[PDB]
Amino acid sequence: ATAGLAVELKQSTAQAHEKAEHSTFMSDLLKGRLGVAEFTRLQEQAWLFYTALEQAVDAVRASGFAESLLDPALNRAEVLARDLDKLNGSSEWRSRITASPAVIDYVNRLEEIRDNVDGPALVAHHYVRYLGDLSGGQVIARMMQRHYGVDPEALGFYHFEGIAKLKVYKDEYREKLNNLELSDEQREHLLKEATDAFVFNHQVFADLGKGL
Numbered sequence: 001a002t003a004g005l006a007v008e009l010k011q012s013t014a015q016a017h018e019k020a021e022h023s024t025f026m027s028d029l030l031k032g033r034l035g036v037a038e039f040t041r042l043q044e045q046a047w048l049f050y051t052a053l054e055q056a057v058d059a060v061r062a063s064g065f066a067e068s069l070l071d072p073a074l075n076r077a078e079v080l081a082r083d084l085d086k087l088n089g090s091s092e093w094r095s096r097i098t099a100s101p102a103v104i105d106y107v108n109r110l111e112e113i114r115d116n117v118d119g120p121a122l123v124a125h126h127y128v129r130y131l132g133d134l135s136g137g138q139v140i141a142r143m144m145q146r147h148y149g150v151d152p153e154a155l156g157f158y159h160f161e162g163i164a165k166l167k168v169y170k171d172e173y174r175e176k177l178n179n180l181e182l183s184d185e186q187r188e189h190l191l192k193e194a195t196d197a198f199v200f201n202h203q204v205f206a207d208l209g210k211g212l
């Protein structure tokens with residue numbers, strides 16, 4: 001549409017984004033109703049899906065698609081594992097954690113995108129996760145420190161070590177989106193995938209809200 005991909009993504013995903021953002025689990029977490037335990041469960045599930053997402057990013061980058069956008073400085077899985085070591089006090093969690101049903105679907109989609117090397121689909125998922133982390137991530141980190149006394153060294157996920165000027169980086173991210181060479185089919189595919197990405201994330205929160 002008329003104002004470029006970054007604008008079309010934001011508008012197209014608005015309804016799914018709002019649903020995800022206002023899940024009961026995330027709402028209770030950010031208001032201080034839960035605890036470090038619940039934050040840890042979230043980060044455990046996020047480690048599972050970021051691990052899958054980053055295999056898909058690596059596959060797509062290697063194909064030569066969206067290279068400048070798929071900045072490896074964004075990788076969260078390793079930082080996340082370090083956070084989880086601190087949150088759980090040992091590496092015990094690696095052999096304990098299991099994917100919730102929501103995370104199974106989400107990982108399965110990311111693995112399909114990986115093995116298909118589906119560039120447009122991968123960009124959609126990259127946008128929903130990383131640009132969200134860059135944008136609202138400092139708010140989440142601040143609330144985890146404020147409400148629950150989480151040590152900032154256990155919030156490495158939100159820090160983005162290697163990025164100095166965060167506002168400039170987000171602006172340049174949106175310009176890289178606008179600059180991607182996409183057919184109508186590819187652009188439509190990307191947009192639909194971005195909505196599905198928000199849908200997966202909402203179900204992840206729903207399953208966390210339950211005993212799952």
Ligand SMILES: C=CC1=C(C)/C(=C/c2[nH]c(/C=C3N=C(/C=C4\NC(=O)C(C)=C4C=C)C(C)=C\3CCC(=O)O)c(CCC(=O)O)c2C)NC1=O
Binds near residue numbers: 009
């Ligand atoms: C499934 C949950 C969830 C995801 C995946 C998410 C992603 C997400 N959050 C964004 C921005 C943002 N997101 C937030 C806030 C939050 N972000 C949060 O995850 C939480 C819990 C808050 C607290 C309200 C803020 C303040 C922005 C700023 C805006 C912007 O740059 O457009 C963007 C940027 C949009 C854009 O500029 O196009 C994305 C993709 N937001 C979500 O809520």
